[PDB]
Amino acid sequence: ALPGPSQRQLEVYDQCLIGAARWPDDSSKSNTPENRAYCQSMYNSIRSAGDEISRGGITSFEELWGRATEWRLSKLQRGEPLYSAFASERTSDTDAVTPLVKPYKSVLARVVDHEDAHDEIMQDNLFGDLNVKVYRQTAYLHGNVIPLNTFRVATDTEYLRDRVAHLRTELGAKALKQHLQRYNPDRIDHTNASYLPIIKDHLNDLYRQAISSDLSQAELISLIARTHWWAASAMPDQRGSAAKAEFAARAIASAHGIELPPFRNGNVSDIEAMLSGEEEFVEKYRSLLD
């Protein structure tokens, strides 16, 4: 038995920020209607899942993820085409790339200015050799250090500005876009699906620890961050993993009566997780909040 959701709640203002994607750049997404509702609901469901966790109703990360997923699928517009992707685990031969474009363009800077980014040369069938700033996210798992997400940000701006206009016309928009869907010089090549089994087992191990009844506040926050970190960086599902990961992290916190405030504006949790190392993330977790 754990405390369960606290009696004292966040302000309704903050409840409408829980689960929001507050990109530092674009900030015209407070469309109260949908978004503020979505957030409020995520906030309620998180406390509910927390309550189930404190009562043994949820007994594994896998189950919490399941709860987060059904909550997430419920916010989809009816007849939504991506519905299946939101309900499905990523597989080897399933999309694994995210072209760094809007609303992700603020990523580019962070990769380039990344204390841990390194200059690399990329071989491209369309642009040729490109200088790319590269951040390879890695994780420690039982002694095996594995590659999670890899960020690429082409650094030869001018040259690219040209070539693309060139190629767009020389090959036509459709072709070029299809190509950039996977090989956009500015992209995130995500965690290989083949690592999802051990990562999920790891997540279940983190969960089991996290529901301990004698954890200091320090240990607890650390476990929540790590869980948040692994779920988000792993991007277990074809769609909505970021929402599911935040959902899970906060439910676990709520199980202990911790009422986590929303992430700071400009602070998009999963991106912050993907851009960091696990220990770094754990250390900066609190500062990413309220």
CA dist 262 and 125 (Å) reads 43
Q: Which residues contact 287 (CB under 8 A, 6 or more apart)?
A: none
Q: Which domain holds residue 148?
A: 96-189
Q: Does residue 247 sit in the same domain as residue 168?
A: no
- Helix axes of 157-171 and 173-183: crossing angle, nearest 10 degrees: 130
Q: Does residue 289 sit in the same domain as residue 200?
A: yes
Q: Which of 158, 189, 220 is the last residue of a domain?
A: 189
Of the candidates 20, 74, 67, 16, the one whose C-alpha atom is nearest the C-alpha of residue 46 is 67
Could you tell me the maximum CA-CA distance found in the chain, to the nearest angstrom? 65
First to last CA, the chain: 28
Q: Does residue 205 sit in the same domain as residue 184?
A: no
Contact 148, 136 (CB under 8 A): no
Residues β-bridged to residue 89: 237
CA dist 162 and 209 (Å) reads 53
Q: Does residue 46 sit in the same domain as residue 9?
A: yes
Residue 102: Cβ within 10 Å count:
9
Q: Does residue 199 sit in the same domain as residue 261?
A: yes
CA dist 44 and 115 (Å) reads 38
Q: Does residue 4 sit in the same domain as residue 90?
A: yes
Indicate left, alpha or beta for 186 from its phi (over 0: left) and psi (-120 to 50: alpha): beta
Q: Does residue 46 sit in the same domain as residue 108?
A: no
CATH of the domain at 36: 1.10.3290.20
CA dist 95 and 85 (Å) reads 10
Contact 94, 237 (CB under 8 A): no
Q: Does residue 55 sit in the same domain as residue 181?
A: no
Alpha carbon of 37 to those of 16, 75, 176, 283: distances in Å? Answer: 7, 9, 37, 31
CA dist 177 and 184 (Å) reads 9
Q: Is 132 exposed, middle or buried (0-12, 13-18, 19+ CB in 10 A)?
A: buried
Q: Does residue 212 sit in the same domain as residue 288?
A: yes
Task: Domain count for the chain, please give it.
Answer: 2
CA dist 148 and 217 (Å) reads 28
Q: Burial letters for 151-186: b for 16+ Cβ neighbours within 10 Å, e otherwise?
A: bbbbbeeeeeeebbeebeeeeeeeebeeebeebbbb
CA dist 186 and 189 (Å) reads 10
289 phi and psi, to 5 degrees? -95, 170
- Parallel/antiparallel/unpaired status of strands 144-154 and 130-141: antiparallel
Residues β-bridged to residue 146: 139
Q: Does residue 21 sit in the same domain as residue 156?
A: no
141 phi and psi, to 5 degrees? -140, 95
Long-range contacts of 95-99 (CB under 8 A, 24+ apart): 95/238, 96/189, 96/190, 96/192, 96/193, 97/181, 97/182, 97/187, 97/188, 97/189, 97/190, 98/187, 98/188, 98/190, 99/180, 99/181, 99/184, 99/186, 99/187
Handedness of CA 79, 80, 81, 87 (dihedral sign): negative
Q: Does residue 198 sit in the same domain as residue 239?
A: yes
Q: Does residue 196 sit in the same domain as residue 169?
A: no
Q: Which method was used? A: X-ray
Q: At what resolution in Å was this solved?
A: 2.2
